[PDB]
Design a protein around this ligand. Structure first.
Ligand SMILES: CCCCCCCCCCCCCCCCCC(=O)OC[C@H](COP(=O)([O-])OCC(O)COP(=O)([O-])OC[C@@H](COC(=O)CCCCCCCCCCCCCCCCC)OC(=O)CCCCCCCCCCCCCCCCC)OC(=O)CCCCCCCCCCCCCCCCC
Ligand SMILES: CCCCCCCCCCCCCCCCCC(=O)OC[C@H](COP(=O)([O-])OCC[N+](C)(C)C)OC(=O)CCCCCCCCCCCCCCCCC
Ligand SMILES: CCCCCCCCCCCCCCCCCC(=O)OC[C@H](COP(=O)(O)OCCN)OC(=O)CCCCCCCCCCCCCCCCC
Ligand SMILES: CCCCCCCCCCCCCCCCCC(=O)OC[C@H](COP(=O)(O)OCCN)OC(=O)CCCCCCCCCCCCCCCCC
Ligand SMILES: CCCCCCCCCCCCCCCCCC(=O)OC[C@H](COP(=O)(O)OCCN)OC(=O)CCCCCCCCCCCCCCCCC
Ligand SMILES: CCCCCCCCCCCCCCCCCC(=O)OC[C@H](COP(=O)(O)OCCN)OC(=O)CCCCCCCCCCCCCCCCC
Ligand SMILES: CCCCCCCCCCCCCCCCCC(=O)OC[C@H](COP(=O)(O)OCCN)OC(=O)CCCCCCCCCCCCCCCCC
Ligand SMILES: CCCCCCCCCCCCCC(=O)SCCNC(=O)CCNC(=O)[C@@H](O)C(C)(C)COP(=O)(O)O
Lengths: 62, 178, 459, 88, 76, 169, 221, 53, 99, 16, 126, 55
């Protein structure tokens, strides 16, 4: 699903869901272990915002 | 860790995962061992009471209600083992888990400091040389013509053969490298 | 000044007559001797200015720039030694000649006593940077980047030429000291306002000012390491020196024509620090950090406090050294992994401990660690800006916070964390590049030890 | 000094110790190759309890999918040895 | 016993660079530091004196340190 | 080497020791040991160094500049005497900077010497500092980065004109 | 493998802390301030393969940087109004309106001592090794802002608004940190919030005109 | 043959000597105010003919 | 497809020359260029030049201005003169305009 | 200094 | 007594209702996603465990991400009134805002100096 | 000391109790780390990328 054609330079880049890398399964041997991402899978537009050293979107107890 | 996740979690797997998570949060709340044993026996009794369900849509609804109750009554700080993700010792030694290919870049003097270990290292490298083509052929042969395939890998199918893609698993750094 | 210009000139026949197995050694050693000879301009035992001849002179502001250029030339050869090892001998000697031409023309540019000679040497220095970026750049965007850089700078520099010729016709000689002595006040008319803009916008493009800074990141990315050094460490400071030389004859209307450029500089260093936070290219991130630092230099030069001029001077020298060191570390990583991605190489602290140490000191100099000349420049610029207006401290604080954030984000995502174990083509270290980092970092320590050399004209 | 290293025999002895202490497993029919359902007659909840008992003894977490794969004490011991790098 | 190999990167090149850097720096500076210590122990250390009447001092004679006076006399 | 005419210091008034207790003073014991171990070899080395200095004694002089004509008697455009007056002004500016440093060191020394009585006994140092900073603000303030003898003269002329206009009424 | 590296890092932190403590002028105290902050960053991110450790070090750097902004504001104001960073000229500056530099020093002390608003960098900074936790975050670094306020206490005594907001901020942060400490499970986090609550007690004591009691509590704590 | 092999090593020192020579030529060219500055107007010593060369 | 050389792969330079110093492929030019950089970079520039800069005397007359400041303070304090006059220029030798 | 580890019993406390 | 998700606190994969009322097309979608994931993992594992490899492994996803974040923006940008207004406000409104702030402060300070009400008691290093 | 001793004995007592927002607030750090460390970096980096660089 691409970004809507609002003329912001996105184009055909997919709208990956706004989930950080913290929600990714930490018991899995990801190809990029720090990034918790595999090889060849699409990369979020805000990966540098959603890295584990940065903004977290994880579910909270309350 | 040593097994790849499937396409989806079955209902039985989800029930077991909910049971384990509920008992872990129960021990986080109870702290004391006798109290945890009492309330964990109560939780096991609840699961055994809801065990024998045949309609399975009522079972899915019961699972949804039970995990809703779990999210309402979960510990804000559940107990995490130190080596577990989110723990205290998690990824503590990744700074010491040096990959094995730097010994290829080691100086000949440093190689001469450890002669026997390095000789065993080229023995292992020669074994990898000899096994790579055979395991690539095995991977190409065992690939199904259909688009279905999982992340599982075949074993060695005859004598004198190694499992395909064995190098990164066998030669991984130790969890206590020093 | 001739005793520095002539042997640098004679470096070119040495380059073209040396053996192909001795050219790098001979030129590097003799250019180190050029820097040693250029160190004699610091013999200033009097308040008077070193006027060597009717054409060349040395100054408390011009001297550190000349010494910096003469010091960077052997470092330039060292950084250019590696990526030209598979290259033809004639093209290698041509590249060395281009760097030597940069060094010669920049010494004459900083030592010129005439603004028209300064302008001639200004885009006489523009030409070989174009040639270096366009020929020895790696990606396909080097041609576009050279076009952008050259035409921003030339559309800047043409009204400077018209303003210079008008000033020469109005006064008579355009000599720097004659202008400084018989400076006449301006009538604050529209002609004088447009003349002020004409003589300001060239150096504002070369700085670069915010809004017109777009040539710098692409030129720095698609440039080679020597082009990145020459740009980020000499050419922006050359625009700085141009504004400092030209601002003396622009009283009194600079006190209100300074207004849009100060605001542009403050908001632009905030903007570019934010871009440094959300930047995916290491060379682009260092380039935008350079844009923010030169925006601080704009703010100081335009508020025209003596403390601000000093802070601009020390920030010139400190930012040139630390930006050259940052581009060298980035280029070492680029020659390792053949990529410029910020996030691709992560755990280099493990494989390269000494290079990660150099990374750490370079970033600490970048984020203004005390008692370095970097922080002395930013702190004195802060003091002068707060004297100019008390509400500048908010923008300064936001800039410093995001500066620390992007420097530590650099360190964390390039050195710390788990190692990308798939990069098995990681050679340990070259003594050449480790020497390059050491020769970048030691003069920072020495100038921190003695900061009186780079204080500038005001004090 | 501290933290003595593990051994295959010690891991096997500790796993069989916990399984003997488990009330649903009689110690006379317990072996290292005894299956939890085929000849021990347990179920999935009992298996999860056994995994959590091993987890609480050895002070580290077996992940859920590997834990569901472990099904006899020999596989449990092999997993412990593989995870803690015990080779003798 | 039962000690195991520790996998480490090539520290040989970093150690060699540090050794060469220290060697060249000491090779040039230890004669310099020894000479500085000797000259400040023995000779120079010019003290402030009033200008005698009718005497025109040399430019280096306005400077304090012996090395500064020598450089000013020989090269400036 | 320094003189109390330009670095004034009141004479020290230390009290005589009157130890009421019978315990020995570890400070006095450690001080006597400190002299006997450290101060004697250090002063021996310094005496050897000083007699080597006396063996090779040299002299240097403090340079003095005669007064060139000031910029007020100096024609505009004639850049020779413009230059001479401007460098004389720059020299006097640097001298005034160091005078300010001297007064600031005097004020700091007064504050550290008085300690808790600095609000009363540093009245003379504070008054001298206030007078010299009023004079400095009258002569050199708000000149800008391109401060010069011409700019200083213009500021002084503006201040004199303002004072003359205020003195009419 | 890096026990010598650890020992050298602790020694460098001690040097920077002694510089910060014994410095006479604000530039030298500022050298000590950021040297302590940077060595805190390195010692928190000692286990540099840990993402949580790197994150905690980065946010410790962030809060210390906001404190640095407050310090820079105070330093610049004192340079412009008293021509020096020397504490003697500050003592002579005791007799005017010092609201802006006292606000800057208050912000700096809040950032360094982890009061309310800028608190959680300390319990995040617990991520590093225990001797780092003790020496850095328990005894020496956390009392640096309190120490700065003790240094500038003659200025502090003459401003009643500053004293009231110091007292209120200290009471709020010791209450909040004790509330947080009541239910934590990690023992290091519990005694870290104990450290922050005692720092709030010192901050209350500096809200009163009792700086020497605050320094006595610094040594005691 | 050493002078033939290492003749490239004299070009930069020759340029340095030439630059010093040209600085000396400029210095003796700009002598229109020698011993004529009002700051340094002094009577010539009998053992000298110029204040600076 | 147009004729074009294949993409080269960078080789492990340390494989054939374990004492590689970063300068040139063969060992002799590499080690001599290393020695030339070390001797001309640190030895006779970063130390000799540092000594020369350190022993430049009276740099922009800080020491002379200090001595002159002490002399002027002594003069004006033993003769009771003000330390600094309010006017740099003598008011008698300035001709102000009549209006 | 080194003592025998205990599996589930009370550890042998040294006198010091 | 219900958890409310947020952009910064998302809904859990066990509290969402989408995986309790499952569908065969969602099941086969998960199957095909696992198939693509396994194919990419197999390709990466072959390239990673290849001994004849003498370099790193290039990531086309990372290359695509860098190109999309850097070079594709201006070819794929079209001016709309929304982004025109956004660019105008984000490039000017802070500038006029800080212009008015600094202009008011400097005019007030200049006026206070002109009638002398502002006192610079020891301000000599401006 | 006495209040926390009797509270610890109550935790020793064999009864589960439903958690309250006071203990949730105390255990979850007062919600200041979660709330601030999620909303301020997200707004800062979102403003940076979406406005500054891109726009
Ligand atoms: C009188 C009667 C008519 C009134 C009327 O029509 O009013 C609406 C009319 C705007 O028309 P609209 O409703 O946006 O039309 C949209 C189309 O129907 C539908 O849009 P479209 O996609 O069909 O059109 C394509 C695109 C066509 O492409 C463009 O419009 C390209 C962009 C044009 C310039 C945009 C400037 C603002 C952005 C700046 C970004 C930062 C720069 C760095 C700082 O149009 C747009 O993007 C729409 C906005 C058009 C704005 C035109 C402005 C012209 C005057 C510019 C003056 C100078 C500006 C500052 C220059 C500074 C230089 C240093 O005027 C106003 O709203 C008044 C203000 C106009 C500007 C002053
Ligand atoms: C990189 C920046 C590019 C844009 C800004 C360019 C500079 C803008 C300010 C200067 C005006 C233009 C250059 C004139 C140079 C000489 C100035 C001067 O001497 O002024 C005093 C003079 C006046 O001289 P005067 O002082 O003798 O006035 C007469 C006074 N009396 C009668 C009392 C004696 O001003 C001019 O002559 C200015 C006329 C300029 C007309 C032509 C302008 C053409 C367009 C210029 C920009 C083109 C590039 C950018 C295009 C857009 C790109 C996106
Ligand atoms: C980018 C942001 C641009 C806008 C910044 C905010 C407004 C700045 C206004 C300004 O600079 O005002 C200064 C001056 C005020 O007018 P005044 O001092 O009376 O000048 C008398 C002239 N006859 O205004 C003037 O003298 C009028 C001309 C000002 C030109 C300033 C530069 C314009 C942009 C160049 C790029
Ligand atoms: C271990 C080896 C040690 C070798 C000795 C020490 C190193 C070399 C000296 C380093 C000096 C660093 C500082 C340079 C100061 C230059 C001063 C100067 O102005 O020199 C030009 C001067 C012009 O002469 P003139 O103006 O007429 O002065 C006569 C008196 N009125 O003309 C002269 O002064 C004459 C020329 C002599 C000074 C040349 C300085 C340039 C640098 C030379 C580097 C040489 C390195 C040799 C290495 C050999 C290795 C095998
Ligand atoms: C100017 C523009 C530059 C642009 C970039 C240039 C790049 C190329 C640079 C080439 C070399 C140029 C070096 C320039 C910096 C020189 C630093 C220096 O020596 O400064 C002098 C300073 C002495 O201080 P001073 O000048 O008096 O000023 C302070 C008082 N106002 O010295 C010092 O304070 C100390 C000197 C350095 C530190 C000492 C190093 C040697 C230590 C040896 C210790 C040995 C062991 C102990 C021995 C016994 C000690 C008792
Ligand atoms: C000098 C240059 C001045 C340029 C002025 C441009 C004004 C543009 C006004 C306009 O059309 O705003 C539309 C914008 C969003 O409306 P729309 O284009 O439908 O966006 C789709 C999703 N919101 O509307 C808004 O963003 C709302 C603005 C409320 C005020
Ligand atoms: C009674 C009176 C009461 C008064 C109360 C006053 C309260 C004032 C509060 C002022 C400070 C508020 C903002 C603080 C931001 C802190 C952001 C931060 O570092 O967050 C850390 C977070 C990850 O860390 P965390 O979530 O804690 O832990 C994860 C562990 N797995 O995320 C990260 O690590 C992200 C990495 C950094 C990303 C870039 C951040 C740039 C921030 C630029 C800010 C510019 C403006 C600053 C203004 C300061 C004003 C004081
Ligand atoms: C802390 C708060 C924790 C709250 C947890 C509350 C959970 C208690 C309520 C329940 O257990 S409802 C459970 C609903 N699950 C079912 O109905 C699953 C039944 N379906 C089956 O197939 C079952 O027979 C089994 C047990 C999954 C089969 O397993 P076999 O042993 O392999």
């Amino acid at each position: 699903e691409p970004y809507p054609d609002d003329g912001m330079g996105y184009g055909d880049y997919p709208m990956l869901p706004n989930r950080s890398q913290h929600e990714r399964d930490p018991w899995y041997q990801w190809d990029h272990s720090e990034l918790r991402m595999n090889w060849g899978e699409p990369i979020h537009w805000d990966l540098d915002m959603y890295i584990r050293n940065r903004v977290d979107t994880s579910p909270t107890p309350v | 860790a040593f097994c790849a996740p499937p396409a989806y979690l079955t209902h039985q797997q989800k029930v077991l995962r909910l049971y384990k998570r509920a008992l872990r949060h129960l021990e986080s709340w109870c702290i004391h061992r006798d109290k945890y044993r009492y309330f964990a026996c109560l939780m096991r009794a609840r699961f055994e009471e809801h065990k024998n369900e045949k309609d399975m849509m009522r079972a899915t609804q019961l699972l949804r209600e039970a995990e809703e109750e779990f999210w309402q009554n979960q510990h804000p700080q559940p107990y995490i083992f130190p080596d577990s993700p989110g723990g205290t010792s998690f990824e503590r030694y990744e700074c010491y888990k040096v990959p094995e290919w730097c010994l290829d870049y080691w100086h000949p003097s440093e190689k001469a400091m450890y002669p026997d270990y390095f000789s065993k290292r080229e023995q292992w490298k020669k074994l990898r040389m000899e096994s790579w083509d055979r395991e690539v052929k095995q991977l190409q042969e065992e690939t199904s013509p259909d688009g279905i395939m999982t992340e599982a890998l075949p074993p060695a199918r005859r004598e004198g053969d190694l499992p395909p893609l064995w190098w990164h698993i066998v030669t991984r750094p130790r969890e206590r490298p020093t | 000044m001739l005793k520095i210009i002539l042997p640098s000139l004679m470096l070119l026949p040495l380059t073209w007559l040396s053996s192909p197995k001795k050219t790098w050694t001979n030129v590097t050693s003799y250019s180190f001797l050029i820097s040693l000879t250029s160190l004699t301009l610091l013999w200033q035992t009097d308040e008077n200015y070193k006027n060597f001849s009717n054409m060349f002179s040395s100054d408390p502001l011009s001297t550190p720039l000349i010494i910096l250029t003469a010091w960077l030339l052997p470092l330039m050869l060292m950084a250019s030694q590696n990526h030209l090892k598979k290259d033809n001998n004639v093209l290698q000697k041509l590249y060395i000649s281009m760097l030597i031409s940069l060094q010669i023309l920049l010494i004459m540019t900083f030592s010129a006593t005439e603004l028209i000679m300064f302008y001639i040497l200004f885009e006489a220095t523009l030409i070989p940077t174009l040639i270096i970026i366009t020929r020895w750049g790696n990606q396909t965007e080097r041609l576009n980047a050279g076009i952008y850089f050259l035409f921003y700078t030339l559309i800047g520099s043409i009204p400077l030429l018209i303003a210079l010729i008008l000033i020469q016709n109005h006064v008579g000689t355009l000599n720097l000291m004659i202008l400084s002595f018989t400076t006449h006040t301006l009538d604050a008319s529209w002609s004088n306002n447009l003349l002020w803009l004409a003589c300001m916008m060239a150096f504002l493009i070369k700085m670069p000012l915010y809004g017109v800074h777009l040539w710098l990141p692409k030129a720095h990315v698609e440039a080679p390491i020597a082009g990145s050094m020459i740009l980020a460490a000499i050419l922006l400071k050359l625009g700085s020196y141009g504004m400092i030389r030209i601002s003396i004859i622009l009283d009194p209307l600079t006190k209100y024509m300074a207004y849009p450029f100060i605001l542009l500089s403050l908001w632009g260093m905030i903007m570019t620090s934010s871009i440094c936070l959300r930047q995916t290219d290491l060379k682009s991130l260092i380039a935008y950090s350079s844009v923010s630092h030169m925006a601080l230099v704009i703010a100081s030069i335009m508020i025209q406090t003596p403390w601000s001029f000093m802070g601009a001077t020390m920030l010139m020298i400190a930012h040139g050294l630390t930006s050259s060191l940052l581009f060298c570390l980035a280029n070492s990583n680029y020659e390792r992994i053949h990529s410029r991605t910020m996030i691709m190489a992560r755990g280099l602290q493990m494989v390269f401990p000494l290079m990660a140490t150099w990374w750490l000191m370079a970033s600490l100099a970048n984020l203004a660690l005390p008692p370095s000349i970097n922080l002395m420049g930013e702190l004195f610029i802060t003091m002068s800006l707060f004297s100019w207006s008390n509400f500048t401290i908010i923008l300064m604080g936001i800039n410093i916070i995001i500066t620390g954030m992007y420097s530590m984000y650099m360190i964390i995502t390039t050195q710390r964390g788990k190692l990308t174990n798939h990069m098995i083509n990681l050679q340990p270290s070259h003594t050449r590049e480790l020497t390059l980092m050491a020769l970048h970092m030691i003069p920072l320590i020495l100038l921190t030890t003695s900061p009186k050399l780079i204080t500038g004209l005001t004090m | 000094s501290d933290a003595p290293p593990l051994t295959l025999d010690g891991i096997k002895d500790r796993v069989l110790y916990v399984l003997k202490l488990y009330d649903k497993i009689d110690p006379e029919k317990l072996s290292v190759n005894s299956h939890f359902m085929k000849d021990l007659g347990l179920d999935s909840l009992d298996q999860v309890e056994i995994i959590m008992a091993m987890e609480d003894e050895f002070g580290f977490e077996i992940p859920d999918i590997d834990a569901e794969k472990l099904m006899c004490p020999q596989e449990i011991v092999d997993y412990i040895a593989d995870k803690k790098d015990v080779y003798e | 016993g039962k000690r195991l190999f520790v996998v480490k990167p090539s520290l040989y090149y970093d150690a060699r660079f540090l050794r060469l850097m220290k060697f060249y720096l000491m090779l040039t500076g230890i004669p310099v530091i020894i000479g500085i210590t000797l000259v400040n122990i023995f000779i120079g250390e010019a003290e402030l004196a009033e200008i005698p009447e009718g005497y025109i001092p040399e430019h280096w004679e306005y400077y304090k340190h012996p090395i500064s006076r020598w450089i000013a006399r020989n090269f400036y | 080497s320094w003189d109390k005419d330009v670095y004034p210091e009141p004479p020290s008034r230390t009290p005589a020791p009157s130890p009421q207790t019978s315990l020995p003073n570890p400070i006095t014991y450690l001080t006597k040991a400190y002299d006997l171990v450290v101060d004697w070899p250090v002063t021996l080395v310094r005496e050897f160094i000083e007699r080597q200095h006396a063996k090779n004694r040299t002299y240097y002089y403090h340079r003095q500049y005669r007064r060139v004509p000031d910029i007020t008697e100096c024609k505009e455009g004639d850049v020779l005497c413009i230059y001479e007056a401007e460098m004389q002004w720059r020299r006097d500016f640097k001298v005034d900077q160091e005078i300010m440093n001297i007064i600031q060191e005097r004020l700091k020394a007064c504050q550290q010497r008085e300690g808790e009585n600095y609000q009363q006994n540093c009245a003379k140092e504070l008054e001298q500092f206030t007078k010299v900073t009023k004079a400095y603000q009258d002569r050199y303030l708000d000149l800008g980065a391109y401060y010069s003898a011409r700019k200083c003269l213009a500021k002084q002329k503006q201040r004199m004109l303002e004072e003359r206009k205020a003195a009419r009424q | 493998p890096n026990i010598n590296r650890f020992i050298k890092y602790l020694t460098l932190f001690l040097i920077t802390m002694l510089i910060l403590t014994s410095a006479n002028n604000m530039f030298q105290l500022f050298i000590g301030w950021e040297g302590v902050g940077i060595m805190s960053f390195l010692l928190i991110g000692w286990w540099y393969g840990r993402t949580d450790a790197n994150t905690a070090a980065l946010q410790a750097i962030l809060y210390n940087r906001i404190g640095d902004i407050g310090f820079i504001l105070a330093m610049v104001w004192f340079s412009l109004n008293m021509n020096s960073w020397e504490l003697q000229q500050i003592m002579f500056s005791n007799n005017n309106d010092n609201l802006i530099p006292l606000m800057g020093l208050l912000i700096a002390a809040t950032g360094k001592s982890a009061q309310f608003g800028l608190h959680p960098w300390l319990p995040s900074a617990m991520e590093g090794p225990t001797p780092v936790s003790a020496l850095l975050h328990s005894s020496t670094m956390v009392v640096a802002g309190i120490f700065l306020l003790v240094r500038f206490h003659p200025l502090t005594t003459n401003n009643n608004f500053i004293l009231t907001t110091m007292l209120c901020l200290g009471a709020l942060t010791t209450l909040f940190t004790a509330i947080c400490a009541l239910t934590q499970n990690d023992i290091k986090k519990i005694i870290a919030f104990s450290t922050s609550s005692q720092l709030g007690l010192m901050m209350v004591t500096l809200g009163m005109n009792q700086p020497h009691l605050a320094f006595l509590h610094i040594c005691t704590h | 043959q050493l002078l033939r092999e290492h003749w490239v090593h004299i070009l930069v020192p020759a340029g340095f000597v030439f630059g010093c020579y040209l600085d000396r030529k400029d210095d003796e060219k700009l002598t229109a105010f020698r011993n004529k500055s009002m700051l340094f107007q002094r009577e010539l010593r009998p053992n000298e003919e110029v204040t600076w060369k | 497809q147009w004729q074009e050389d294949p993409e080269p792969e960078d080789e492990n330079v340390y494989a054939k020359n374990p004492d590689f110093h970063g300068y040139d492929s063969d060992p002799v030019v590499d080690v001599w260029n290393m020695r030339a950089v070390f001797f001309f970079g640190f030895s006779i520039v970063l130390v000799f030049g540092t000594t020369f800069v350190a022993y430049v005397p009276d740099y922009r007359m800080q020491e002379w201005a200090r001595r002159e400041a002490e002399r002027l303070v002594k003069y004006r304090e033993v003769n009771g003169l003000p330390i600094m006059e309010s006017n740099y220029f003598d008011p008698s030798k300035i001709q102000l305009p009549e209006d | 200094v080194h003592i025998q580890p205990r599996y589930r019993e009370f550890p042998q406390l040294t006198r010091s | 007594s219900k958890y409310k998700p947020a952009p910064l606190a998302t809904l859990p994969s066990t509290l969402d209702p989408a995986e309790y009322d499952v569908s065969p097309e969602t099941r086969r979608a998960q199957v095909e996603r696992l198939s693509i994931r396994a194919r990419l993992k197999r390709e990466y594992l072959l390239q990673y465990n290849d001994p004849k490899r003498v370099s790193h492994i290039e990531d086309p996803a990372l290359i695509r991400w860098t190109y999309a974040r850097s070079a594709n923006i201006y070819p794929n940008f079209r001016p709309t009134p929304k982004n025109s207004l956004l660019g105008a406000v984000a490039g000017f409104g802070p500038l006029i805002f800080w212009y008015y702030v600094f202009k008011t402060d400097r005019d007030r300070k200049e006026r206070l100096i002109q009638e002398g009400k502002l006192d610079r008691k020891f301000n000599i290093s401006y | 000391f006495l209040i926390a001793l009797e509270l610890n004995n109550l935790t020793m007592k064999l009864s589960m109790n439903k958690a309250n927002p006071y203990s949730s607030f105390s255990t979850l750090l007062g919600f200041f780390p979660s709330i601030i460390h999620r909303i301020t970096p997200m707004k800062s980096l979102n403003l940076s990328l979406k406005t500054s660089l891109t726009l």
